[PDB]
Amino acid sequence: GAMGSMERASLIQKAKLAEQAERYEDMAAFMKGAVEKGEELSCEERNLLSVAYKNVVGGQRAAWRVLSSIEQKSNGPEVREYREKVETELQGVCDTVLGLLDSHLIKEAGDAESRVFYLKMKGDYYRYLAEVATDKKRIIDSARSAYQEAMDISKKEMPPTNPIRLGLALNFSVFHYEIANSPEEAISLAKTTFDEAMADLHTLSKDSTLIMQLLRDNLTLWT
């Protein structure tokens, strides 16, 4: 791999530089290189991995949605071709992330924080695949199964206010609403999650109110 000759610590350092420079493709490539060193990731390093790929795929998703909307309105080959080009690139990034998860990260992750984090990522990237799929049913099932395993662990091992637990619940509720055609399940999940977190605030000394607000924002739109 192109990063094989660079020290792990140097890859991490350069990922952090790339983050400051808003060079997310570079950031992702540095973090992929780091993963491929074969050592587990720390909490901070997992965050760098996630943010990098979330920004790469986010730009591809936004572009895909622009092109798909133009395509749907049109209904020559150019709009479909270019939509397909963006779609293939998006799929490739999702496949790269899922490959890192499968080959390197999920099987070695024993602590609840890391395991839930990676299983959430797996659900997220299957979700992104599902947004463009038409096939679709198997991808949807793969996202659901990853999210559900993460949920089971998070409920057993993490407090209701843990930010990973909260972000997982937020994303799984969006999966229910937008992907799985299950708005009632989405609403139930978001509401139970929010209420249980409210009741656990008392034990605490920013990430989690942020996410709680996002749950409330979705609930406001959905109800």
Ligand X SMILES: C=CC(C)(C)OC[C@H]1O[C@H](O[C@@H]2C3=C([C@H](C)COC(C)=O)C[C@H](O)[C@]3(C)/C=C3/[C@@H](COC)CC[C@H]3[C@@H](C)[C@H]2O)[C@H](O)[C@@H](OC(C)=O)[C@@H]1O
- Residue choice 2, 5, 20, 135 for contact with a second copy (CB under 8 A): 20
- Residue choice 17, 62, 199, 210 for contact with ligand X (CB under 6 A): 210
The span of 77-85, 95-103, 142-150, 200-208 binding a second copy (CB under 8 A) equals 77-85
Identify what 13 binds: a second copy, ligand X, Mg ion, none; CB under 5 to 8 Å per kind.
a second copy
- Residue choice 69, 72, 74, 81 for contact with Cl ion (CB under 5 A): 81
Q: Which of 137, 138, 96, 145 shows the shortest CA–CA distance to 120?
A: 145
CB contact burial 82-115 (16+ within 10 A = b; e otherwise): ebeebbeebbebbebbbebbeebbbeebeebbbb
Q: How far is the C-alpha of 80 from the C-alpha of 142, rounded, in Å?
A: 27
Least gap, CB of 136 to ligand X (angstroms): 23
Q: Does 158 bind a second copy (CB under 8 A)?
A: no
Q: How far is the C-alpha of 178 from the C-alpha of 26, rounded, in Å?
A: 30
Least gap, CB of 17 to Cl ion (angstroms): 9
Q: Cα–Cα distances in Å, from 69 out to 83, 95, 126?
A: 10, 24, 22
Q: Which residue type occupies 58?
A: G
- Residue 181 is given by DSSP the state S
- Residue choice 10, 47, 96, 145 for contact with ligand X (CB under 6 A): 47
Q: Which residues bind a second copy (CB under 8 A)?
A: 10, 13-14, 17-18, 20-23, 26, 59, 62-63, 66-67, 70, 76, 78-79, 81-82, 85-86
